[PDB]
Amino acid sequence: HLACTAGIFDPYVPPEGDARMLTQRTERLRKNAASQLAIRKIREFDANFKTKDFPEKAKDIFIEAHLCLNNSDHDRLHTLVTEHCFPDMVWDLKYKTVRWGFVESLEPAQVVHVRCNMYGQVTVRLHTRQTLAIYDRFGRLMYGQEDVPKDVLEYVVFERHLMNPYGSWRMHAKIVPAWAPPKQPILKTLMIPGPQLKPWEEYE
Amino acid sequence: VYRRLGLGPESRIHLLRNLLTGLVRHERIEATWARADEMRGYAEKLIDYGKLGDTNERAMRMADFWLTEKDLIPKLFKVLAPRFQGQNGNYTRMLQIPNRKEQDRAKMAVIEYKGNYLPPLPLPHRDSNLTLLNQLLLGLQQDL
Amino acid sequence: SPTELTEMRNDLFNREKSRQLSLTPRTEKIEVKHVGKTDPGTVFVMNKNISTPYSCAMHLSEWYCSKSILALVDGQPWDMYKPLTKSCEIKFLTFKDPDPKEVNKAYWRSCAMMLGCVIERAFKDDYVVSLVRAPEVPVIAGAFCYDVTLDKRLDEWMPTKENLRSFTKDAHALIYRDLPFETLDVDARVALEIFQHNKYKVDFIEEKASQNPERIVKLHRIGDFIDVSEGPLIPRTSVCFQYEVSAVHNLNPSQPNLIRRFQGLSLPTHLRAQFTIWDKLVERSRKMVTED
Amino acid sequence: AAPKNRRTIEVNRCRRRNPQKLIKIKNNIDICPECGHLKQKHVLCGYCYEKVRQETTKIRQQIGAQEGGPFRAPSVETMVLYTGEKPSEKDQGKRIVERNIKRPSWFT
Amino acid sequence: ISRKWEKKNKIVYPPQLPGEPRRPAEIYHCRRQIKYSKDKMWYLAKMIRGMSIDQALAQLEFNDKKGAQIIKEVLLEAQDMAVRDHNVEFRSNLHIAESTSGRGQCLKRIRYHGRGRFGIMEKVYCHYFVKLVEGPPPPPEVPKTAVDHAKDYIQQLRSRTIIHTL
Ligand SMILES: [Zn+2]
């Protein structure tokens, strides 16, 4: 039994300069021809799904799921996220202690694009400053700063099972815009190994 | 002056005969270090018998007995002997190889005939004169 | 008092280090590819102006650290402890390299710098000792030479066998101390202030500043002692295994000040010498060495 | 032969932990520049030597096929030639072994 | 069977505060089942105690005992996980803090003899425990000088307290 489907039905294409950005809101109306029919399908099962008000509900789930990471609240995080998303959040945090905080959002969250026996995936645009610091098993700090705010803009996809009467919106996937800068580098230094060869073989 | 090898004196010579025949055929043989050292003297003296001359009747008797395969007998007088005519000795090169990892940890060495067509062995190299210590010694040599 | 000069000399060295550290914001990742003969092609992502060739040696193995005395960054000799500046190709230089002439010069210069440190502290603070320069002589000469100008009070004093042994004891203590060679590139204006009292050191700073387009000069510090360097120096003083103060030759033009050129010989741990060989080398190192 | 009483672990522990019975460290370990691997000062590198033997086996295999029979050792000198190298007049009067591989860099 | 050595490797320390020194890394690695005598393995373990990662590897490479080969594989595995999971930046910066061997479960068989006798056949197995601390090996001990010994004796005489008197 699956309550979610891996991947996104159609990947929304972010335009460069959206971070600088009415305007973008109208773009949805222009693109509503592509998405509004999908919005109707979510509305048919729910009738309370609106692109304007969903981000507030969506934003809480995103922040709350990140909060569970600090306390390792796996049971709570299961409800917040879909089955696909859960391993991604916590898999690489094994044997690590993280202090994560959410600073005030730089700009208001807005629904960007939606798609849909029937699984509805809603792409939400979030620009928020957050503080993250991950420590080693021994407590050594390996990534991020304890209380420095990093401004990141990302597009987050939530999903819901429309058919199920109790189906609710759970965090499913994140779309990363190409223009977004690379994430902060790890404190420790890595090495790219050289080619390995047998005795008779020669260097390449 | 002789290692106590073989079930008897004949076995040592027969074992040496087997070792000598293989080395002539291949010109490079890997064996236990003790055996390689013991047979090195015989190989050098055999080359002298080749140098003595093909017509030498005594050399044939020595060559015939020591070399079981008779195709090697022409080779010794027409390949090994001509090859070493310029050389006055040191026909065989024996080097120590890491011990066999066969649970008995035998001391291993490789014995080869010099001037062979086989690829050169990875021989040790003395330090170059360009080294700081050698350069300092060079200055002392120049002054003297 | 000389101690006061070392104190202020040490501080300006420390402040310069802080300024350079402050100059670089954040840690910048530089891709350095290992062009050394052994394990070629390994690429390390390193922190700019922070990572040193020793750190790369630590990354690979301890054998690299022990046998590496210098680093060839983009074909240029770099001190093992000199911070890396950019993505480059790095190779490790050892005493047993086919062409250690570049290594020989660094060892030659470092030995001369160590000798200069011994001279300044060997004499009592009452007497005036000023370091003039470290003459560059070939390794073939058989001895490394350091020039120093003494005070008029010492014009009639020549070291005895015991006095020469005392100099070796100071040099041996320095090797035993195992003081790493700190490296700083400093502008002439600061360098001139650091060595303002020693007029002879002032001109040497000017010469180096004149050669390069900028006024940056190469300064090396062993503990409190600091000196200018013609080129890269040994990472640490422990490299030397045998050290000797062979002899001292007083330069004839000693009217303004008595300029003495001290002869010494040293050998690294990588290159040990037999007792008889060392004795002959020491004897061959007691002869006056001219610069040609 | 058994002692008249059981040997105490304390007594036994001292015997086995005596320095004479402990394993000794070796300081004769050396590095091989040719292979970049460890070696003993009196022992030759095996990583490079392994290449020589493997090439020797390949060379020997070519010779065996060329001879085509047992007890066919030539009475004339032998030489090995690799691709890109052609028999010369100096190679006349010598058995010629042809190798599909190009002349190895180490082999000259 | 007990596998608490692995659990020691699963220990997670509390996050260190910014004003707290970087904790030296500790790696616990062991091979539970080895068809080798613990006593013979202990001899190898005893010698390598306190040595650096590189020095131990070099010594093992030229060791003739089968156990030494096993230790090298165990040592190499420990180094790999230490960098992979314990955030060891430098491969060379590792030393053998602890090395010891333990008994393992054996097998029981009867050893027959050609002339009607029999013996007790036992198939020996052993455990090998090593704890690796990131960093260079600690400096070796320096013997006390004559001056140091003499000073303590005088101090001991002064430290003497009078017995059973007012
Ligand atoms: Zn090699």
Swiss-Prot record, chain A:
> What this chain does, per the record?
Component of the mitochondrial large ribosomal subunit (mt-LSU). Within the mitochondrial ribosomes, required to direct the nascent polypeptide toward the tunnel exit and position the exit at a distance from the membrane surface.
Q: What is this protein called?
A: Large ribosomal subunit protein mL45
Give the encoding gene's name: Mrpl45
The places in or outside the cell where this protein is found are: Mitochondrion
Q: Name one GO biological process term.
A: mitochondrial translation
Family per UniProt?
Belongs to the mitochondrion-specific ribosomal protein mL45 family.
Per the record, the major location class is mitochondrion
* Keywords for this protein: Mitochondrion, Ribonucleoprotein, Ribosomal protein, Transit peptide
Would you say which domain of life the source belongs to?
Answer: Eukaryota
- Describe the subunit structure: Component of the mitochondrial ribosome large subunit (39S) which comprises a 16S rRNA and about 50 distinct proteins.
UniProtKB/Swiss-Prot annotation, chain B:
Q: Which GO terms describe its molecular function?
A: protein domain specific binding; structural constituent of ribosome
Q: Which GO terms describe its biological process?
A: mitochondrial genome maintenance; mitochondrial translation; translation
Could you tell me the keywords of this UniProt record? Mitochondrion, Ribonucleoprotein, Ribosomal protein, Transit peptide
Q: Where in the cell is it found?
A: Mitochondrion
Signal peptide residue numbers: none
Q: Name one GO cellular component term.
A: mitochondrion
Keyword Ribosomal protein included in the entry's annotation: yes
* Record family assignment: Belongs to the bacterial ribosomal protein bL17 family.
Subunit composition and interactions: Component of the mitochondrial ribosome large subunit (39S) which comprises a 16S rRNA and about 50 distinct proteins.
Protein name (record)? Large ribosomal subunit protein bL17m
Q: Which organism is it from?
A: Mus musculus
Q: What is the lineage of its organism?
A: Eukaryota, Metazoa, Chordata, Craniata, Vertebrata
From Swiss-Prot, chain D:
Which GO-annotated molecular functions does the record name? metal ion binding; structural constituent of ribosome
Biological process annotations from GO: mitochondrial translation; translation
Q: How does the record describe the protein's post-translational processing? A: MRPL32 precursor is processed by the m-AAA protease (composed of AFG3L2 and SPG7), which cleaves the N-terminal transit peptide. Cleavage by the m-AAA protease takes place prior to assembly into the large subunit, an essential step for mitochondrial ribosome (mitoribosome) assembly. Proper processing by the m-AAA protease is dependent on the zinc-binding region within the tightly folded C-terminal domain of MRPL32: zinc-dependent folding halts degradation initiated from the N-terminus and triggers the release of mature MRPL32.
User: Assembly and partners?
Assistant: Component of the mitochondrial ribosome large subunit (39S) which comprises a 16S rRNA and about 50 distinct proteins.
Keywords assigned by UniProt? Metal-binding, Mitochondrion, Ribonucleoprotein, Ribosomal protein, Transit peptide, Zinc
Q: Would you tell me the protein name for this molecule?
A: Large ribosomal subunit protein bL32m
Family membership noted in the UniProt record: Belongs to the bacterial ribosomal protein bL32 family.
Localization annotation: Mitochondrion
Relative to the complete UniProt sequence, the shown stretch is: 78 to 185 of 187
Example GO CC term: the record gives:
mitochondrial large ribosomal subunit
The positions annotated for binding Zn(2+) are: 32, 35, 45, 48
Q: List the disulfide bonds.
A: none
Species in which this protein is naturally found: Mus musculus (Mouse)
Keyword Transit peptide assigned to the entry: answer is yes
Its biological function? Component of the mitochondrial large ribosomal subunit (mt-LSU). The mitochondrial ribosome (mitoribosome) is a large ribonucleoprotein complex responsible for the synthesis of proteins inside mitochondria.
Main location, first listed in the record: mitochondrion
Curated annotation (Swiss-Prot), chain E:
Presence of the UniProt keyword Magnesium in the record? no
Q: What is its main location?
A: mitochondrion
Q: Name one GO molecular function term.
A: structural constituent of ribosome
Q: Which UniProt keywords apply?
A: Mitochondrion, Ribonucleoprotein, Ribosomal protein, Transit peptide
One GO cellular component assignment for this chain's record is: mitochondrial large ribosomal subunit
Which biological process terms from the Gene Ontology are attached to this UniProt entry?
mitochondrial translation
Q: Where on the tree of life does the source sit, at the highest rank? A: Eukaryota
Family affiliation: Belongs to the universal ribosomal protein uL22 family.
On assembly, the entry states: Component of the mitochondrial ribosome large subunit (39S) which comprises a 16S rRNA and about 50 distinct proteins.
Q: What is this protein called?
A: Large ribosomal subunit protein uL22m
